[PDB]
From Swiss-Prot, chain B:
Disulfide bonds: none annotated. Signal peptide: none annotated. The chain holds residues 319 to 423 of 423 of the full protein. It is found in: Cytoplasm, Cytoskeleton, Spindle; Cytoplasm, Cytoskeleton, Phragmoplast. It comes from Arabidopsis thaliana. This is AUGMIN subunit 4. Part of the augmin complex composed of 8 subunits. The complex acts on microtubules and interacts with gamma-tubulin in spindles and the phragmoplast. Involved in microtubules reorganization during spindle and phragmoplast development. Disruption phenotype: Lethal when homozygous.
Swiss-Prot record, chain C:
This is AUGMIN subunit 1. Part of the augmin complex composed of 8 subunits. The complex acts on microtubules and interacts with gamma-tubulin in spindles and the phragmoplast. Interacts with AUG3. It comes from Arabidopsis thaliana (Mouse-ear cress). Disruption phenotype: Lethal when homozygous. Involved in microtubules reorganization during spindle and phragmoplast development. It is found in: Cytoplasm, Cytoskeleton, Spindle; Cytoplasm, Cytoskeleton, Phragmoplast. The chain holds residues 200 to 299 of 299 of the full protein. Belongs to the HAUS1 family.
UniProtKB/Swiss-Prot annotation, chain D:
Belongs to the HAUS3 family. It comes from Arabidopsis thaliana (Mouse-ear cress). Involved in microtubules reorganization during spindle and phragmoplast development. Required for gamma-tubulin localization during mitosis. Disruption phenotype: Lethal when homozygous. This is AUGMIN subunit 3. It is found in: Cytoplasm, Cytoskeleton, Spindle; Cytoplasm, Cytoskeleton, Phragmoplast. Part of the augmin complex composed of 8 subunits. The complex acts on microtubules and interacts with gamma-tubulin in spindles and the phragmoplast. Interacts with AUG1.
UniProtKB/Swiss-Prot annotation, chain F:
It is found in: Cytoplasm, Cytoskeleton, Spindle; Cytoplasm, Cytoskeleton, Phragmoplast. Belongs to the HAUS5 family. Involved in microtubules reorganization during spindle and phragmoplast development. Disruption phenotype: Lethal when homozygous. The gene is AUG5. Part of the augmin complex composed of 8 subunits. The complex acts on microtubules and interacts with gamma-tubulin in spindles and the phragmoplast. Signal peptide: none annotated. This is AUGMIN subunit 5.
Amino acid sequence: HRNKREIVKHHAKDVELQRRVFVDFFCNPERLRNQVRELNALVRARQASSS
Amino acid sequence: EMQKTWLCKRCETMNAKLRVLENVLLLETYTPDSISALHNIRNYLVEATEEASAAYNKAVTRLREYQGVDPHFDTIARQYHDIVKKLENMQWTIHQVEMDLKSHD
Amino acid sequence: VMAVKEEQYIQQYKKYEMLLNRVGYTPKISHRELVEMAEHRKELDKMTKPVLDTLRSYQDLPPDKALAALAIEDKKRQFTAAEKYLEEVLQSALETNDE
Amino acid sequence: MSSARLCSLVAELGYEGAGKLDPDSFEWPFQYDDARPILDWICSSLRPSNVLSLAELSLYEQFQRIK
Amino acid sequence: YVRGLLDEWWEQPASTVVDWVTVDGQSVAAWQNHVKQLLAFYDKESLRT
Amino acid sequence: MQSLSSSAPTPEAILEWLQKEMGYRQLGPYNGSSKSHVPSIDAIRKICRGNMIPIWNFLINRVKSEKTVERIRRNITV
């Protein structure tokens, strides 16, 4: 619980750092049409942090 | 000598620790569905099920729904093949009763 | 090892009043009816499950019974529109069960 | 809990059950919702609530036991 | 009330208890889209502007 | 089973609400004896009260006994 609860605070930026470095290189044009639906594009990084 | 006291000071804890957690899952199995029981205090339109239950009595209208072919009898004269598919629909209203009120029951 | 890890061992007593779990049926008393509204929609959807083969016959009406297509087609919808006038508020609460 | 089905009888008398709109969820606690008639109909309502509560209470009955 | 039998095993062997502290966080991942917005949607203006 | 219960749900569906509880029950045995299957249930809608009183009173919430059968009865005790 020291880390399982804290890893929630990590993915506030963990699903962002790898997303910005490489994922945004093919998702920034997508975000114009993904300005609402991007949470589905977010599931592949948030559940990884659940471990 | 001390096991009747300290090895048994948990005689009054294993009774409790085992028991207390038992009455936990049953309540937790209904919280995700409890929103509709609580977000719908005035929206208990489970009443609208019976305000919309009128889906049943139109089974009578199903007895006389396909009878619009009869006035234009010459239409099926050139379309004699379609009536074969219409055969399996005339008697559904008998058992539609069970469903069209199950539509709201 | 029991200096501090007994906390979870001694926390088992504050949850003694938890025996109230029998109230679990109380939402099931209601929300099942609330999702019955959702269950009615699939039973509303059962209107066409014998009629899905009738749409095969209904497809052949407008080409032939063009004028009669406005007296038999919607007549099937009459037992599906027999609920729509209070279906919107039904959807307003089964969405808490579905949406 | 059978008194919840008593509040059901307010179905056809729906215009009087307007206050019984929220308890459409809280239906188990209908005993306290009808607390006022309890003192006048406790005799009729003593037998259902007793055995109904005995089902959970029955778990404690066995606590008594060559060279 | 056998339903809560595993909940006693959720006390000392409570790996499950700390395991689902993320699924409810995952349940608010839609609310985390705003948290996603402060950095990801800031890259939207990179090509928008 | 109360509130907006005997005003909108009850009267427009007198042939529909208050007999749908046993519409699956009586369809085979009792709703088929007469030649007019469905129209007889309009008269059977009256007699449906005699064979089964209580779920009629489960108006807004749990009158839907065709799929509330495990829930109409458990409201007695559970």
